[PDB]
Amino acid sequence: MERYENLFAQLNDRREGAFVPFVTLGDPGIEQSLKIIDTLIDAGADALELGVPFSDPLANGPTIQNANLRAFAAGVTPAQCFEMLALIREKHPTIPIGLLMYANLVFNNGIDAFYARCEQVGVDSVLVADVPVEESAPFRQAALRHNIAPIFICPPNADDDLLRQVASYGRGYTYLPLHHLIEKLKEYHAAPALQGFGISSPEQVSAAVRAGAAGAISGSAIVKIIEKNLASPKQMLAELRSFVSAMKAASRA
Amino acid sequence: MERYENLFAQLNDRREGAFVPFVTLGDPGIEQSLKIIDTLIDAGADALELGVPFSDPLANGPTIQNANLRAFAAGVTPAQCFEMLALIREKHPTIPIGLLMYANLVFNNGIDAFYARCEQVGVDSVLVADVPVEESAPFRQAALRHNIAPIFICPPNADDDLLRQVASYGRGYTYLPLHHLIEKLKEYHAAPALQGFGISSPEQVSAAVRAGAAGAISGSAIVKIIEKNLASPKQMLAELRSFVSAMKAASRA
Amino acid sequence: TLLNPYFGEFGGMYVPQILMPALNQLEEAFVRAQKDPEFQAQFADLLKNYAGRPTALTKCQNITAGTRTTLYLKREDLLHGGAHKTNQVLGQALLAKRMGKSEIIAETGAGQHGVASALASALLGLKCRIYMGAKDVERQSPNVFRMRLMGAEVIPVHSGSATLKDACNEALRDWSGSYETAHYMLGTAAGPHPYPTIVREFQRMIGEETKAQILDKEGRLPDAVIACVGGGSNAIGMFADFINDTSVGLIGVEPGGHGIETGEHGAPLKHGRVGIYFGMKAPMMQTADGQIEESYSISAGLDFPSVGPQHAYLNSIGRADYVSITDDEALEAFKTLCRHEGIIPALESSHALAHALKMMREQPEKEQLLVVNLSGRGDKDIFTVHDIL
Amino acid sequence: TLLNPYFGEFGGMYVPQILMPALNQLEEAFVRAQKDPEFQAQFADLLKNYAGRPTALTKCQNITAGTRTTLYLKREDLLHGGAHKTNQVLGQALLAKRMGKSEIIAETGAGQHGVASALASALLGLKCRIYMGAKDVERQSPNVFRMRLMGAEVIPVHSGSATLKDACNEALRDWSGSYETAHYMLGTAAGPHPYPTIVREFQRMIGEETKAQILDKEGRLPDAVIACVGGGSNAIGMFADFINDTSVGLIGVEPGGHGIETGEHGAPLKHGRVGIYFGMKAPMMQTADGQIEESYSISAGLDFPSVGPQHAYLNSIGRADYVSITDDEALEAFKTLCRHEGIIPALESSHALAHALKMMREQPEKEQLLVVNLSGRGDKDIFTVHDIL
């Protein structure tokens, strides 16, 4: 919730956009994953988007699907993910931590209980990929009473009626003609927008910021590096560091 | 035709019945077959029933079916059968020679032509297994004008209407309560009856003669001996000789 | 006999004397049954509520697009069992019961008739024993297991060439001694009288339905009705009701196999010689000597080495015309129907469709209303076709 | 939405925001189409002249002999394709066309839906691409080849467990970007609204026909209608018209597999926990964590790890009752039907029959008029059964 407030305010003072990498928790293993995350943070990540391995990634492409398989191969479970989350927060007090979730893991044994666990471990926001604005009521309500920011996706095929809902319901950040959506969101005072359309190059980050977005999210590009250096964990880290620094450099410059 | 007349008259003077063995022409080979036939005649056969190998023996049991297979394995053809028939007649002037045929080999290239060939080689009668009294007109007509005796089967399920037809149509011999059929045939003056219900033992021959039949025909029993001694042609002959002498002895005694 | 056993010079009752009473009994039963309102009512009930009649008449627009040809397919592939064989098999089973018979004997090439015989028997509480050619046993294993699942006793024949003709041979052998309690259920409109007549009458609903359906949809009779011809039952079933409609062409399609000239075919009616076998006088596949040969085709169902006598007669007088279609032609028709209409036809039926496609393609501007008898579904043929492609 | 997406607490539209417009478009199209006399006329024409409707309602006397039970089987096995899936697949294809869409996307477990999707598309000139679970590809090879023969592009999914649920996952993935030109043809009465409602309405003719047929033959409604339940389409199709007839029992039969207690089953409605997936809120096979598992059954067609929301709701209010049937029970019912009625049912349908047989046998003196929905034929199952016996 508020960690996003502070970050975006800071970034604005510095006149720079936010670069947020996404990774699957426990991919390719708990220890290596924890190290990957520390490297992302150390390399320049302003916030984090973390997914917990789900059996059926309804809205996930190949790269991420494979991340889930590797995570599951390591026996990663949501309970293990929450343990990782607490540890990450204990080491990094201010980075906004966002969760990329699937509805069943949230609903499984109580929506409210899920948001209670999130608040307990220090999570800041939760994006339920398969819960559209039309079914969000119980999720956004439980999120708000646990000081968790409910994140909503503003798709390309979004009408004005959807823009208004997203602006009214979302908190922390809005998962994003482009300038039209961006300016309409700002008009409706939606949470700062973070672009998420396959961002894999430095030029894409500056472009997103120049368009009026508060930042850009990169997922597949990050995971790709992991998949490539699966046999060389140290080289994985080194490459991750280079990528993140490159992407972050592109948000200020 | 008349060879049957003479045989039955002779047998009657001797107060004995006729024993007629059946064999497939060319089974298991032309030479061996010719030898089998000479042995049957030498052992006591009063007449002969000879079948020409047909592709589909509609009314033939296993034993005989196998005879056809062996004959066909030796490449026996109807043309080859007629050559055998001429030779058999040249060696034995008086034995009545009867053919057990299937309709297609008779009809193939002219019913009349078939009966002409029969008369030419010295055949005495022709029984077309698959031509019932109801379809016999062209066959019996062609047979009669070529001095060939048309043989008809008087089945067990024969009514009086059938008995009259068989008596009127048949010549040479009638292929046969039993006493009822026998006496009704005699009443209608049918050709001498030769019983053909699986005759394989001496007692069966005397029984048939005692019942008022002019004789008995044995097929499977004969072929059986061949099938058994297929590996010992000389023993085949010796066994055939013993069987035939035994069966013939049973017709007079 | 009560009825004429001949269609011109073709037909008859060429069986051993011992079997004539059985044939005469069957003919009398059929004649009485045909006059019996109750026999007809029950037959009709089974056809409707059990087999699924009437079958649909599908107009196939996609395949005739761009030509003046309007094609309809009589959907016998939708009949219970997946083929037209069920129709007559049900009537014969009721006939057997009418005669007080509790057992059934049958023969098969492609397991379809045996399966249909097994299903009817299971339904009507009849003890059924089937005769399949030893070779066909291994070729049509799925059909074999089906027969067994339906309680019929399957019996392979290793005699002769171990195929349909030899199977037909064994069934007759059996019947010769059991006729008193068992009924021999012949699978096509061939064999000795009254079978060619009985099978036609118990299949004629195909043509009667087609007539009503075409009059309803088009307001006129078709220019021609086309059907494959193995032994002749599906074809005569379609033809029957149109015989007196002189304007309607009747086209029978025999298997051309690898090509008539190669000798590897199963088209005796147009490329064979008249002989006597299977209890009838009809054209057949035979050597110069008179030994009967086998009919070759990509489709096992069209392997009967002879043809129904009524077909040979309808041909002789020029009422019906017979043509042949090659394996490759049938295969193509098979592929085309799947892709353009979403229907998988039996390779047998594909020969009929193949010809209708030829009539269309050769003269695309000729206006013609055609009806192809889709005698069966080709699910059974996916493997075969798949082995070719 | 125009219609209620929920059946009590079950249902909804749990899909990524990007897919909501596609769902809304589809719902509007369906609502307009349902009010359109011409849409209904064409749908009906295809059902009658192409698919072969109405299907027969067979009274099975042999199986109920000696009991007070009268059993009728709704013959969906006689429908073009050999299963009920064809009905709704035809309506959805017409819907896609109504929306100006030229392409179709589908998913499969047992190749039946993909085959039905491929046939409808071939018929209606639609470009079809199917998603099959990699494992199921090799298991249902015949169905695969059939799909290809009908021109559909078959695509195996190697993701997750490479089964139906993962296939459903891939199809959605595709649709998310192609919704503009392609229609996702869901195969059962599950998934996000309006699919559960659409599939029911396009399958309801099963029950409407059964009602008219039973009133015609018996002069009364049945005491109960029984159908297997994989995703729920064949069952809801039968149930639909009887829901307001309070005296008629609605019994759904889920696969018990090797036994409920073994955990190896596919009965989420009665032995699962409510979750959110496949775009809906419904009971499902899942771990304590909330990870979704697979449904096990001898029959591949009943492997959907969840159930239609309307079924879960009809159960909650006590309108319909759900029970389970083991592989061995289905196998037995399968064998019994073949031997006593000459009908080979699909192992799926065998679960429904198995239950009706249990109702009869447990209380043989209870007078009951039952209707079992024979959703498909078991030709596809002869091998499987043969491997067991």
Ligand SMILES: Cc1ncc(COP(=O)(O)O)c(CN[C@@H](CO)C(=O)O)c1O
């Ligand atoms: C779908 C279909 N259509 C046509 C035929 C050919 O015979 P018909 O000409 O008698 O109709 C068959 C024959 N099938 C034979 C095989 O010789 C059988 O014993 O079953 C068939 O299965």
Ligand SMILES: Cc1ncc(COP(=O)(O)O)c(CN[C@@H](CO)C(=O)O)c1O
């Ligand atoms: C004959 C028959 N009856 C029943 C069902 C089960 O589904 P239903 O409950 O939706 O009707 C199937 C399903 N078959 C699924 C497999 O998961 C398919 O993709 O095709 C079927 O093939």
Ligand SMILES: O=P(O)(O)OCCCc1c[nH]c2ccccc12
């Ligand atoms: O792969 P990219 O670069 O397009 O990442 C996008 C980032 C967040 C993200 C990760 N997994 C998802 C599943 C559903 C919705 C959004 C996501």
Ligand SMILES: O=P(O)(O)OCCCc1c[nH]c2ccccc12
């Ligand atoms: O085998 P058996 O001893 O009963 O012989 C019977 C003799 C004649 C015979 C040989 N083959 C046949 C085919 C049809 C009709 C009769 C025959």
Ligand SMILES: [K+]
């Ligand atoms: K033929």
Ligand SMILES: [K+]
């Ligand atoms: K299920």
